[model samples]
Target: SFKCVNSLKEDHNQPLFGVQFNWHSKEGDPLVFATVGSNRVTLYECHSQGEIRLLQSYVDADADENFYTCAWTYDSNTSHPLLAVAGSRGIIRIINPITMQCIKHYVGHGNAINELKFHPRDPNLLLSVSKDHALRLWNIQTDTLVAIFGGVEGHRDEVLSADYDLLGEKIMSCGMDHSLKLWRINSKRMMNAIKESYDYNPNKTNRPFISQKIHFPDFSTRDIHRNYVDCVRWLGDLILSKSCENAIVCWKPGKMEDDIDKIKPSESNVTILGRFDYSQCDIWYMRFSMDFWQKMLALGNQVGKLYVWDLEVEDPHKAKCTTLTHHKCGAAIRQTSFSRDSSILIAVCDDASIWRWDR
Candidate 1:
């Protein structure tokens, strides 16, 4: 079980949807964290004495941009201060809070963009999923839509969330259709094409310089989740998904290697490894540690509580489950995640508050 070390409310009255610990935050400095929703994105710093204080806030000028989802860029200082926000009007804007300037504004999707993520290594690239049944790749520097993945092979309903693979070469997206899909970006080839195109024509505004469908390569078995799947994550080589099935299921992609899989389309199939049930609980979020060697899994529920489990045992289903003290915010816990070192667990609730535990 986790200790409830600190709980702090947001300045605004609206619900908070996204909260995450910065990967670049170190223990020596304040444990910097971020929360987004309502009309703003707020950054907080937790001191050694368990005090959580506001360090900065970014209030949107446009009322429509005050919706769900935001992400920090890479761990370097140059890009680290950058944040991306997806708005209700299908706009994706990248801003620097220190200077408080919106550097790039992109309006590509017809429907709402629910989630936005920065590439792991490429600071100038972003990935977004929308309710329009589309996944888009963006070139931040050029403020261009590199490519869109939609139509037949993509989600039939709105895609709720997506995450890039460890190598940043692939993607996994979960949708309201209760399906989990895999996408391969062909990053090396895409990068080469970008270089070639830029050299060929520097002022090519009419044509997209680097453009290709971030191909949909695979998906999970459809019969698992009975309702809209809310979240999907890549755990090492395996896949994890959660929905209204009253359970969280971990799946193994039938195919593994990049180049070998395309030879047979059937290898795209997914097989179930295990399912962790949360009886009478609506699991809102599930997160696996970024540390490859760690076998810890975490999930937040609609009841304002958090669950942590150890998956290193012979059977992950039988692994030890540790429940943290409820935040008692009278709202669903929308997000729960571990610090980069896996020592701290943080949560954000619809009550516009953030809670943290030093495990």
Candidate 2:
């Protein structure tokens, strides 16, 4: 039951801290990286020796605040990587990986940062959610806030998780409000409202609104999560996954908003794909592996247990899944991530250590 043929220890300055995996970085390089108590990032790259090696130790003496989230956006054209970190102050700092320097910082959020993600389909755009009860869309080139998404009509609470669908046109957020909001990222929109008037307006073109709206529905209410909600993964086809109702609930928002004048549960808008529960009552993070041919899903429990669900042969709905309790009793898993390179699993626990589990 132990496939951890290789285990490496993570050390950083200060008291040792938290970590989040970056998909844009190459494997064997920062595959499993953690933020230290010293506010520096320590990365582990698997060396030819078959042991995880300490590749780089990046520190920002000016990063006085704790970094809650870290993200990397890789530009294939330039082969250059831009690393960004979000802090409790809602400031997102875009850093130059080569120089390990902070290039630009976006300060707007008034509370702790919860999520930071780049549009999967458009690497140039950044999506940020925070305790400020807002989700912000940003333009990488101009380093400015393109749009701020928040409302009580549908989603009234602070955004906990936000991500873009495969097309980058659809964006979704899940949060303490017990709701998930789907926003359409109209293509060709300029950062400036003045320029957007004449230069860009693709949504007004030949595209049909119904089909475009279907690709990105508005908001749906959920009472699944008893208390604090976790991440919301934006799966394509108007489908999304979020922590609520004590399980991973796949959601689809229905047509038409909730008309106080007239609407039913079936008609009021929203449907659940399926309810997938974790071992403990409190599971926060879940991720799907790239090898869909194998049909695997990985999840992190509050107690630091990582369960791997095999959905290839049997119906994940009808079957009980398998478990891979990788983290020991020493750590409580706070987050779990898979590299886009498709090889390793990055596990961060409460003990402030980062663990790497491979295929």
Candidate 3:
């Protein structure tokens, strides 16, 4: 069972669109967390004793845009704990929560920036997806757009979310088009490859070919859902994708190295590990937590109900799914994230409040 230990509310009653933890920060910093929405970003300190204190709140005076998402750098070895905040205007503002000031601004997306993610291995690299139908990677330190991912074969609709794998070799994205795509971006050598492709070759007229490829589902499998896959995440080696179709499908990409360079999988190389279904439900958000002995799956549904599943149990379909409901939240869930220790789950609701579910 999960119990609510703490909650947060805004003064003007605006919905909380996104929530995330600075789980990858260095020591000496307090347990910092951020929530974005209603044209503002608010930073909070979560105490060890279960108290939530406000550290800073930021509002952009130049524009009335809804801040949709926020993220933190994995390493704060720089001046301070770096925070990247995104809004409806497609602008990204990097801030230092400790100093409560804006350090840099990344502006390249032409439409609303739906998500922000920092690279797992490089703190200077940041990732973003937008309604402009593109995924843009940024050099946060230089405030320059490193690359943009979109072309004739890219997502036709708004890309809702994107996440990096533990190995940082690939990125998984899901969007309003009801498709999940995997991109092979080995950043360690990608820039060099691009430069090589663009260099003047006196021998040939056309440029040499060296570009990253996007992998899409073959859509031939019966397990693939027919609805918008709003959220996607990585559980170590497992890829979990949640959709509006009332199910969470765990995909095991078996030896995908050979096929990672195609627009779509040549064959259905994806093995469906399991299809965890929810009766009469639609899941908008999900995340996986790993402990020494077992793995936990958390889901937030359309009706503001939180579902926690124990993957270690035999057959998740047969195992009971605990539904956490509170009188204070009756609106749809906007986002769901877990604490670093996996002992706490934070669910943001359309009711404009943040609810904490503790183990």
Candidate 4:
């Protein structure tokens, strides 16, 4: 038996796809935000640290009316977070988080953009991936495509998840193709990559940085999930991780490069941080809580359920899975997100509704 209380569904014509939160807000008022598959992005002021208050909205004129997914940047000086709108037109419009202004646009992805992320340390640098099976790097200051990954033949599918090294030198990407790509970044450009994994540098402390791919010692590709591989993350100091295949997989980037298994030189196989086995068929949706220090993991299930797992547990394999309250009609669990502290939990479903359960 369950009950449905607070249902903030995007306007019927607007299909909500993804959600995220902004802590860098100007007024010290945290916000829970979502992007519409129908040319709009909405922000709600979060209070009592949990309840939501409508604050701002952005509508993309260039949007093809259904590109739904969008991203936020806190580096700007505003109580509202910076918004990046992904449209069917392949043009990204940057919105002023406060005024909801469409001040600038960057066009590069050949198809609809699936996601966008700002460089972890460099606020002006951004990474975007699209259904076109391409990964693009943008200099937000210049509004230019500084670099592009994935050619016409690259990835073989959509690019799903990617992020820059928080240390500010490299970027790693993963997607539906079941491939992981690493790139080197700089104040300037390095050599051009002819293909997705053809490669460049990721750890350069300066410009014209050299790059290479982690070989993974011919690690068997069979271990990868057959459905959709949607994430790759840099975990802690020495571990770069993937969060979609049942458990979050972690490995040392340098070692993972030579051989995927080799990432655990003294150890064998990648270390499994947290694991899950609750899916009616296949667990296609899991989101990582990428807070700077604390780690929280959130996911939506195939059956309309959203869950959050606290990573503060002591034991590795013997730990129990943590789940928040389930939404009525069980939530299809499509879009999930956590606040900057990795505490506020937000997830949405196919029925065009969203729910946030705070700590």
Candidate 4 achieves a global lDDT of 0.58
| Model 1 lDDT tens row, 62-100 | 766666787777524354567777757787767675554
Model 2 stretches with alpha carbons more than 4 Å out: 8-22, 25-38, 48-50, 60-64, 75-77, 187-217, 238-240, 244-246, 255-267, 281-295, 311-320, 326-329
Error of 3 at 288 (Å): 8.0
User: What residue runs in model 1 are displaced by over 4 Å at the alpha carbon?
Assistant: 26-28, 75-80, 187-210, 214-216, 255-263, 266-269, 283-294, 314-318, 327-329
Give me the candidate number with maximum TM-score: 1
How many clashing residue pairs, candidate 4? 15
Residues 89-160, candidate 2: write the lDDT tens digits.
667777776666777778878677777888766666788888877777666654445666664543466777
What are the lDDT scores of the predictions, listed in order? 0.69, 0.57, 0.68, 0.58
Model 1, total clashes: 0
Candidates 1 and 2, the one with greater lDDT: 1
The C-alpha RMSD in Å for every predicted model, in order, reads: 3.4, 7.0, 5.6, 6.9
lDDT of 3 by residue, 1-359 (tens): 56888887777477788888777656766666788878888887776656788778888765578888888774335445678898789888887777657766867675899888887777777889898877877665534455677765667788878887885667777787776666656655556543443453536555333334433322222245687666777766667777777888877554434333343544555666677777435554333233323367666666767777777665444445677888776666677777676766778766778887777
Candidate 2's TM-score? 0.76
State the local distance difference test value for candidate 2.
Answer: 0.57
Per-candidate TM-scores read 0.86, 0.76, 0.81, 0.75
In the range 1-359, model 4's lDDT, one tens digit per residue, is: 11223456677544466777765555455555654556677877666634667776776654456655667675444333577777567778787877888888876575877677886665666778787877777766534455666654346688777766667566666677775555555423333432222233344324452232222211212133455767666644333334344545544434234543233223333333444454442544344444445455566665666544545666433434565565364646656766676556666666667776756
Which residue segments of model 4 deviate by more than 4 Å? 1-5, 30-32, 75-80, 152-154, 186-222, 237-274, 281-292, 313-320, 327-329
